[PDB]
Amino acid sequence: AQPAHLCFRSFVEALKVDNDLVEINTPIDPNLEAAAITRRVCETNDKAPLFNNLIGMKNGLFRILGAPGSLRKSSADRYGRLARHLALPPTASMREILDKMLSASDMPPIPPTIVPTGPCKENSLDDSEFDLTELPVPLIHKSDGGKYIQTYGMHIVQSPDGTWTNWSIARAMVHDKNHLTGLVIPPQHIWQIHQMWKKEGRSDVPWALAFGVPPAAIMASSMPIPDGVTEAGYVGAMTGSSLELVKCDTNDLYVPATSEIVLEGTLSISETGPEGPFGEMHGYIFPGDTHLGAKYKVNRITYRNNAIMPMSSCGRLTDETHTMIGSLAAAEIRKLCQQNDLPITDAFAPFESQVTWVALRVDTEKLRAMKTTSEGFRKRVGDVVFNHKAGYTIHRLVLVGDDIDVYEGKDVLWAFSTRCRPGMDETLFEDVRGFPLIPYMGHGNGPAHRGGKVVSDALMPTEYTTGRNWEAADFNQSYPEDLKQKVLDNWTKMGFS
Amino acid sequence: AQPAHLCFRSFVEALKVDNDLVEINTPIDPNLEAAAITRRVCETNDKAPLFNNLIGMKNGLFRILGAPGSLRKSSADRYGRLARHLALPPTASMREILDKMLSASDMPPIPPTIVPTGPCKENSLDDSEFDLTELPVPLIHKSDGGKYIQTYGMHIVQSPDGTWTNWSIARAMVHDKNHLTGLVIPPQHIWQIHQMWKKEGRSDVPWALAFGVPPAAIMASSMPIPDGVTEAGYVGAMTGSSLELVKCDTNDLYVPATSEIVLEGTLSISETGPEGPFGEMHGYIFPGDTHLGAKYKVNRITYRNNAIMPMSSCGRLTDETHTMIGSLAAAEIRKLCQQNDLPITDAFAPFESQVTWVALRVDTEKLRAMKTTSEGFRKRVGDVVFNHKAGYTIHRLVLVGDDIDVYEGKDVLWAFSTRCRPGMDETLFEDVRGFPLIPYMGHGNGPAHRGGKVVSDALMPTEYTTGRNWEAADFNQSYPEDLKQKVLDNWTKMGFS
Ligand SMILES: Cc1cc2nc3c(=O)[nH]c(=O)nc-3n(C[C@H](O)[C@H](O)[C@H](O)COP(=O)(O)O)c2cc1C
Ligand SMILES: Cc1cc2nc3c(=O)[nH]c(=O)nc-3n(C[C@H](O)[C@H](O)[C@H](O)COP(=O)(O)O)c2cc1C
Ligand SMILES: O=C(O)c1cc2ccccc2s1
Ligand SMILES: O=C(O)c1cc2ccccc2s1
Ligand SMILES: [K+]
Ligand SMILES: [K+]
Ligand SMILES: [K+]
Ligand SMILES: [K+]
Ligand SMILES: [Mn+2]
Ligand SMILES: [Mn+2]
Numbered sequence: 001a002q003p004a005h006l007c008f009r010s011f012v013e014a015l016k017v018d019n020d021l022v023e024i025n026t027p028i029d030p031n032l033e034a035a036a037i038t039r040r041v042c043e044t045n046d047k048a049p050l051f052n053n054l055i056g057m058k059n060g061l062f063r064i065l066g067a068p069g070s071l072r073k074s075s076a077d078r079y080g081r082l083a084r085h086l087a088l089p090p091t092a093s094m095r096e097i098l099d100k101m102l103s104a105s106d107m108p109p110i111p112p113t114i115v116p117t118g119p120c121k122e123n124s125l126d127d128s129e130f131d132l133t134e135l136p137v138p139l140i141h142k143s144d145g146g147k148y149i150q151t152y153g154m155h156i157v158q159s160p161d162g163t164w165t166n167w168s169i170a171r172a173m174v175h176d177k178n179h180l181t182g183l184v185i186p187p188q189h190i191w192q193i194h195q196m197w198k199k200e201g202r203s204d205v206p207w208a209l210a211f212g213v214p215p216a217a218i219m220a221s222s223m224p225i226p227d228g229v230t231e232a233g234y235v236g237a238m239t240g241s242s243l244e245l246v247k248c249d250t251n252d253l254y255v256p257a258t259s260e261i262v263l264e265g266t267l268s269i270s271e272t273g274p275e276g277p278f279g280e281m282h283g284y285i286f287p288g289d290t291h292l293g294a295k296y297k298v299n300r301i302t303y304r305n306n307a308i309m310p311m312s313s314c315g316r317l318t319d320e321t322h323t324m325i326g327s328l329a330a331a332e333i334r335k336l337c338q339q340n341d342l343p344i345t346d347a348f349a350p351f352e353s354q355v356t357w358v359a360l361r362v363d364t365e366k367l368r369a370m371k372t373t374s375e376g377f378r379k380r381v382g383d384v385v386f387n388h389k390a391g392y393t394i395h396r397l398v399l400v401g402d403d404i405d406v407y408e409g410k411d412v413l414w415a416f417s418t419r420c421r422p423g424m425d426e427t428l429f430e431d432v433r434g435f436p437l438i439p440y441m442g443h444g445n446g447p448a449h450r451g452g453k454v455v456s457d458a459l460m461p462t463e464y465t466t467g468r469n470w471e472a473a474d475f476n477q478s479y480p481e482d483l484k485q486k487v488l489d490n491w492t493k494m495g496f497s
Numbered sequence: 498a499q500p501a502h503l504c505f506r507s508f509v510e511a512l513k514v515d516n517d518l519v520e521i522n523t524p525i526d527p528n529l530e531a532a533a534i535t536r537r538v539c540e541t542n543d544k545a546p547l548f549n550n551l552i553g554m555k556n557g558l559f560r561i562l563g564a565p566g567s568l569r570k571s572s573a574d575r576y577g578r579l580a581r582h583l584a585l586p587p588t589a590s591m592r593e594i595l596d597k598m599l600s601a602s603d604m605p606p607i608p609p610t611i612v613p614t615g616p617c618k619e620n621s622l623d624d625s626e627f628d629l630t631e632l633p634v635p636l637i638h639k640s641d642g643g644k645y646i647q648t649y650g651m652h653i654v655q656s657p658d659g660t661w662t663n664w665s666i667a668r669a670m671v672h673d674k675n676h677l678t679g680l681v682i683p684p685q686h687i688w689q690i691h692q693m694w695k696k697e698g699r700s701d702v703p704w705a706l707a708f709g710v711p712p713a714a715i716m717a718s719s720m721p722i723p724d725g726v727t728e729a730g731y732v733g734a735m736t737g738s739s740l741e742l743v744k745c746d747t748n749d750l751y752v753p754a755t756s757e758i759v760l761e762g763t764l765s766i767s768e769t770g771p772e773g774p775f776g777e778m779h780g781y782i783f784p785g786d787t788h789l790g791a792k793y794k795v796n797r798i799t800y801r802n803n804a805i806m807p808m809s810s811c812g813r814l815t816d817e818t819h820t821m822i823g824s825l826a827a828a829e830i831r832k833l834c835q836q837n838d839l840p841i842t843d844a845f846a847p848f849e850s851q852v853t854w855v856a857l858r859v860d861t862e863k864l865r866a867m868k869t870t871s872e873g874f875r876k877r878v879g880d881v882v883f884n885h886k887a888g889y890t891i892h893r894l895v896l897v898g899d900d901i902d903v904y905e906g907k908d909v910l911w912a913f914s915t916r917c918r919p920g921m922d923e924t925l926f927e928d929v930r931g932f933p934l935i936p937y938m939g940h941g942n943g944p945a946h947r948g949g950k951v952v953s954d955a956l957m958p959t960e961y962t963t964g965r966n967w968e969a970a971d972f973n974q975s976y977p978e979d980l981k982q983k984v985l986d987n988w989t990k991m992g993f994s
Contacts, residue, residue: 279970315970473812
């Protein structure tokens with residue numbers, strides 16, 4: 001067999017064939033060693049590690065693939081791992097990847113297809129046969145408060161009324177032989193659905209957690225598609241094909257038929273347990289910072305022969321928390337702005353900002369037709385984005401004109417640094433939901449869950465009126481075309497590299 | 498031969514021997530072509546171009562050296578051109594370069610030595626023999642308002658009372674056969690001295706402009722050493738050697754004996770002329786933005802046989818306006834903070850900020866002993882720096898703790914983005930002098946000369962009280978030493994690059 005974007009096992013074979021995989025066949029410790037290798041890969045844009053020989057693997061549970069959505073070293077196929085999630089050429093641009101992820105937003109869903117069985121049913125362990133403390137669950141960072149089984153699997157929960165089935169990534173660690181704890185926080189759809197079940201008050205939330213799902217499905221899992229939209233049908237429209245799902249053995253939820261590993265059970269509407277600390281997307285761990293988290297009960301495990309667990313070793317640049325959380329939030333913000341009649345062409349979360357900023361490219365011809373001002377426009381953009389779930393993780397919005405490529409962090413930083421006057425050209429937002437994981441929020445001087453957001457206007461004054469009134473002092477813009485070409489043509493003949 | 502740091506001709510020979518020079522012996526047009534080559538060099542960190550065959554060179558005036566203080570491609574000798582200005586090993590760090598530049602601040606000056614002649618007297622042209630419009634003065638950017646003869650020479654002016662002789666770089670372009678116009682703006686020492694002569698009211702300011710001066714002298718020329726300090730004696734203390742100067746033929750100022758090209762004349766206390774626009778340090782030109790500038794009268798030219806004019810093709814990253822203006826301002830800010838009993842260890846202007854920010858590394862053990870708060874400390878740091886001339890060009894100060902290397906822009910951006918809460922952790926400064934060259938100032942929404950400055954506190958709350966309370970989620974900090982070394986030792990054996 002099945003295509004790489006629809007089958008995780010086929011995706012691993014695609015990374016091998018690409019020479020974008022290192023298969024490590026010698027024993028590797030899930031206590032820190034796997035994650036240390038993976039962390040070094042992410043910090044150096046090396047090949048994805050596949051740990052085929054994990055110390056503690058029992059009865060086919062489990063191998064690990066690290067860095068499944070991290071960057072490649074070359075600029076030509078920098079985003080090729082992400083392209084392999086989506087059936088795009090490995091040379092795809094970030095604009096092409098985000099346009100692919102947005103393509104289903106104005107298509108009819110393609111609902112999933114139920115099939116009677118699949119590879120995820122090759123093996124099973126009941127409530128008397130598994131112990132989550134006896135599996136080779138990784139310790140990802142030396143001060144983590146638990147072994148984080150869940151960094152790149154898909155939580156599956158459904159609204160009490162059955163009308164909305166949500167797929168999302170949210171971290172979880174092993175609590176004991178048959179429980180996890182994890183983050184379930186507003187405004188995330190796992191939390192929205194949990195609240196629906198708690199207000200109904202009758203039972204715990206039927207749940208499954210599927211690891212090594214179809215790559216196109218883990219991308220949508222990481223994307224803030226709208227409230228009430230079933231990710232399975234959005235992935236179906238995006239890929240042009242209905243995803244094959246099989247029913248859980250112990251509940252009526254459906255999981256991707258080729259899922260490497262499936263946990264079945266319940267998310268409690270009443271119990272909590274110690275969760276964290278964890279080395280998180282902004283690059284930090286606060287040792288001993290244990291909080292209470294959601295508590296999951298595991299009733300059954302099913303899995304593929306020779307099952308592979310994907311793992312994100314997240315932290316400092318560059319991993320899946322940057323390449324997928326940032327970029328997919330920026331894509332949904334682009335679309336949200338356009339649907340609110342704001343003249344935004346492109347959005348990207350600069351890696352240099354630890355994906356806490358989103359740069360918004362403005363169609364300044366349209367802006368001019370609005371006959372508005374910086375203060376009015378900044379206000380309007382912030383109100384749209386910072387009061388919506390798609391803006392949750394983003395604390396700074398940078399507005400830039402048509403000359404800036406928002407996918408080039410150097411050009412965003414240049415525009416921000418030179419065209420936005422601190423204070424005057426900015427609007428602060430203190431009455432919007434804040435992202436507490438950002439250290440200046442949850443470990444900062446102010447309310448952990450509120451405010452700390454800013455719109456920074458890097459549009460220049462004439463971009464609102466008559467048009468750009470500068471040329472860059474760069475090779476591209478400060479020299480005529482014929483001269484530039486002469487210089488490029490004579491470069492090596494003159495003696496340069 | 499004489500040493501490279503004391504003689505420009507020896508510095509050019511040192512870049513050749515380093516394989517850090519390309520000698521272009523075929524004809525090159527000073528109308529845009531030289532500067533286009535130079536701009537491409539600066540944008541790619543290539544070798545410095547020496548144009549030995551400039552279209553329009555007459556009677557030894559002149560060759561051009563581009564990119565004299567720009568970066569090299571390698572990380573190992575990135576700052577080697579700057580090190581060659583100062584007799585430092587080409588592998589010198591930015592900390593070592595800035596410590597060299599600061600070393601004279603607590604030494605007695607070594608006053609200069611007068612010698613009866615030198616190479617700068619090999620040739621001369623009087624008021625009837627030269628025409629500045631007939632020399633091969635470069636057009637640096639296609640929309641410049643003039644041919645900018647002066648980007649990397651040294652203006653020499655003296656206080657009416659003779660007690661202070663200032664050396665500085667300030668741009669100037671050709672106005673007519675025997676005049677320049679240029680920028681003379683507060684709070685710059687050329688402007689401070691001009692004001693002393695205008696209030697005396699008796700005559701125009703005796704002036705000289707020396708090109709291809711001793712490299713150690715052009716570095717101090719670019720540095721905001723204190724008011725009333727004669728740069729010649731500071732360079733003498735920094736180098737351990739008294740600089741040799743010769744008297745001007747038409748006035749009583751003294752110029753470096755090995756100066757490649759010397760203009761002698763007067764800076765008018767009454768006349769102005771059209772100056773600019775110019776492709777400037779932040780990366781911009783505003784075409785047709787002509788202002789009035791200072792007007793210089795040229796009475797005489799003296800020059801070396803086969804004279805070389807240094808040229809900065811300034812604009813977008815990376816050139817002398819970044820590597821010298823930013824870094825030398827940051828060095829003087831470091832020292833100014835320490836002299837005000839602020840616990841600052843290091844300062845650097847991140848290139849990513851277009852050198853509009855300075856990152857200040859804090860000794861947080863000392864900070865803890867201060868028993869202060871973010872708001873109080875931010876206020877104190879901003880008042881010291883933004884009310885001093887050394888802070889003029891800098892619009893944002895970022896305070897960072899002991900774990901950040903301020904010389905690594907990636908680490909500054911990470912700290913800024915994750916540890917400074919927008920608004921709450923910042924103090925805006927609207928009643929301080931602003932730098933109008935920054936587009937958001939002079940071409941922005943607010944007063945061109947006032948405010949727009951900010952102190953951004955990227956210290957975390959516990960850094961003021963009990964100590965850092967996090968570990969980075971990175972390879973260095975989230976894995977024990979023995980594991981890290983094992984991973985590095987096995988890296989290639991496992992299959993990585
Ligand atoms: C590696 C990785 C780790 C993630 N960890 C979390 C987490 O612990 N909690 C969370 O709410 N979101 C986490 N996310 C982000 C969510 O997947 C993202 O916000 C998504 O929009 C959630 O789906 P929803 O829109 O259906 O709620 C993570 C994403 C990735 C790629
Ligand atoms: C390539 C280059 C161009 C410069 N252009 C100017 C300019 O046009 N005007 C100016 O006031 N300073 C300019 N400077 C900066 C000053 O040299 C710097 O602010 C220095 O501190 C001035 O000397 P002073 O402290 O003796 O006034 C330039 C520096 C460099 C390296
Ligand atoms: O542990 C982590 O890195 C993260 C936790 C969360 C919570 C919400 C959205 C993104 C993330 S990323
Ligand atoms: O033309 C330019 O790039 C510059 C003008 C000025 C004025 C003052 C300080 C630095 C600079 S840099
Ligand atoms: K989702
Ligand atoms: K602006
Ligand atoms: K100076
Ligand atoms: K702070
Ligand atoms: Mn959802
Ligand atoms: Mn001075």
